């Protein structure tokens, strides 16, 4: 989930936008 | 600001700024 | 901190602190 | 929605928790 992709690994805009409504 | 390790309130902040008026969901357990 | 007008990042922050490990959803348009 | 209840009116814990997962 988001923690694995953006906190314990380096985040990206591509991944962040997967969590926008 | 998005191309780094972002945790906790720092991650929430990034979601808030990127998603804008769309809003977002923060699901740290899923 | 929750019994006031909370907007934007201030509202996100409150959701983050209250909801904890549950996470939350921020839907300003709905 | 949350903006009406917590931003343009005074928020409450009861209402905030409606938006926890």
From Swiss-Prot, chains B, C:
Changing residue 24 to S: In HPRI; Los-Angeles. It comes from the Eukaryota. This is Insulin B chain. It comes from Homo sapiens. The gene is INS.
